Amino acid sequence: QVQLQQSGTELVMPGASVKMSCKASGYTFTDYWMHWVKQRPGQGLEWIGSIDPSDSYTSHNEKFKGKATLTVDESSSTAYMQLSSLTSEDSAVYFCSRSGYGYYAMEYWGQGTSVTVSSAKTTPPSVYPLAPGGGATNSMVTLGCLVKGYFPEPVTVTWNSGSLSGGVHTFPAVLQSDLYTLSSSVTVPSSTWPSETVTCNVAHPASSTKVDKKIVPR
């Protein structure tokens, strides 16, 4: 079975370069063209450039010519793309893919390398409890946790060590300053809060951070 193996993430400083790998297996490497495709968060696919591993002949989207350098290492059956002078515009997922034999549908795809361009250092999140305080019926209370100013992604958010699950919305992180912020809501019967404890648990593996924040009225 053909596999295309790409590194999951790269964190890179603005102005720096990154060289991302796509390691192929399960077929004759030199028999098929390899392709690179960009996808900005929430946006569509953009072709960057393609390479023939037999002789390293390349073709580029004109916009990437001078920006993306495509090479292969035949010995390790590996295709590489080097991106230089990175900016926030380069923050994206980069896929490699492989076409057919003399046919150019992209038959196999790597899982993509997620590139984040930032000069931020590793920063644990500040975790703030979001409590109503007031008159709010439904028999349903909504509580929340604000997870502010961390880097890099990801954080993991649970409620009551995962024992809460049915009414939780954890939103995708957003860029705030040079750092990430996310929020999570949990909707629960008014019996159970504040009668019993509702706690949000926030793990930030990169900073070896693990914080429990009990939601307290007022």
Added chain:
Amino acid sequence: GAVVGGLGGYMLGSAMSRPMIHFGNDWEDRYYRENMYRYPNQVYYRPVDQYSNQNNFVHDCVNITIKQHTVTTTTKGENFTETDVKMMERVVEQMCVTQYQKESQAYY
């Protein structure tokens, strides 16, 4: 056999089998398959000793071979388009690389 294509200092390599080449899209693959007979199957080069490295040899081998092939083709009243020259460049480069490797080895 009979490489000395003097000249001029240039030499003519032996004929090589034409490789299957894929150009990365549907139109060019077809164009190539149909037109590849119009392109060289041997290269002109200067003796390998006269070059600093492979890239230098290859670059010159490509230009000399294409130039010479172009004059012979114009004499026959035929013309190369920009696609022809891009494709010729690639396949002649492959042949020049092979020629260099064989010429470079010739040191035994």
Added chain:
Amino acid sequence: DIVLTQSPAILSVSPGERVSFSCRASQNIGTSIHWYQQRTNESPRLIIKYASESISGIPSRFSGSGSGTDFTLSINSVESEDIADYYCQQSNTWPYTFGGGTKLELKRADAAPTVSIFPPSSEQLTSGGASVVCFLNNFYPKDINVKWKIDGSERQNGVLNSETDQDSKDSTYSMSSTLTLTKDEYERHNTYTCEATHKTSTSPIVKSFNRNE
């Protein structure tokens, strides 16, 4: 450059219904169009090649037709795993180009958002920060506008928004909106309002709180 125009940009469908979407090319490309499916946070996957040719391991419910400039992908009966973005791509000539994509979503009954507003925590206020949070949960359809007001005056600065993907169980959407102010700026005012304009009502839903209280 061959431009590929895909329409519509979003298609709402009911499970089991037969759906189609279109890709049109600015120049004739023969049959050199290929279709890809991309589910949330996954790689694209080839589903039809060269206009109409099936792919090993792809369900037979997928088909394509067309030749020249006008292409169509059809799904005979949509399993829920088909909810995804769909892209066409041409490989006739350089540069390769992609369509802008068509998003598939599940059709459900319209549902107004459940709106909750939260003042800054004492904890955050202690650090000189003030974030006002508004959750707009479980609404449909996806389109929604949020406006912030402070003491009656609208504000479009220091506002960060975030959206969830369509819920796998109830097919609804949720949004988070956070207004961040300096603790000092925040104290200069009393009333804070999150204001949601949704299709479900011509009257915007207003949630607000007064510091004096």
